[PDB]
Every structure is written in C-alpha cells, then in structure tokens.
Structure 1
C-alpha cells in the first residue's frame, strides 16, 4: 500500500502514531510523518480510517 499524508489537513493529533507507530510518527513540527511510504501493515488502513481530518490516504 502507498501511504501519503496531506500536511494541510493534518492537525497533529497523533492518533495515527498511537495506532500504527511503525508507519506514522508525530514530528516535532506538530505534523505526521510517514515512516513507511510503502507498507503492508494492516494498521496503515486503520490509522487512515481513524484520522479526524482524512489527511492520510492509503492506496
């Protein structure tokens, strides 16, 4: 799966990191960072579905 994040939609809540720490990390600038742009981890989808602003897209 291709994982991307739209910085403009990201509010820096950190829910994606809570759910899938190996794929997402809340950076110091208060924005999510995608550690695994291409991943097979099922949690990437879960984090996307839980993002409050839909900033994460998993294809």
Structure 2
C-alpha cells in the first residue's frame, strides 16, 4: 500500500498538490497543505484510483514537502528521511 503526508514545516503554499490531487490534498486555514484522507497522519492507504494523482502531486511539489512511503508515517513526515 502507499501512504502520503505533507511536511507542514517545509510547505510554503506552492499549491501544486491540491490541483494535481484534489481528493488527497487540501489547505488549512493558514494555506498550508495537508492530506484529507487521514488528517495528515500518513496512516490511511491511498485508494488505488488516486495513486496516479498522488504521484503527480509528489512530483510537482517544488519543496518536496509531499512524502510517499510503503509503510505508515504515524504522524511523522520525516520518518523515512
């Protein structure tokens, strides 16, 4: 399975992610992206139908704040860094 999460400390509101995968990434009140599947905790498996969009957002983010992994992040966007 794939999991995704936004590192809110490195996100600078580039806005590429919400457009590429609106069913995965949205913006909080401060304009910072987060994953709507699981309240940005990187624990819900990304639906198969949304993998391509996820990849588009992952590749498009200028700050590499979107992370993609094969195991849950359990809330830590830098777990695999």
TM-score (norm 2): 0.66
* Alignment length (residue pairs): 59
The 4+ residue runs of structure 1 with deviation greater than 2 A are none
The alignment yields a C-alpha RMSD, in angstroms, of 1.2
Q: Which structure 2 segments of 5+ residues have no match?
A: 70-81
1:34-45 to 2 correspondence within 5 Å? 34-36=35-37, 37=42, 38-39=45-46, 40=48, 41=50, 42-45=52-55
Which of the two has higher C-alpha Rg?
2
Q: 2:19 is paired with a residue of what secondary structure?
A: helix
1: CA distance, partners of 2:58 / 2:27: 14
Q: Which structure 1 segments of 5+ residues have no match?
A: none
**CA deviation after TM superposition for structure 1 residue 53, in Å:** 0.3
- Asked if 1:52 is matched to 2:62, the reply is yes
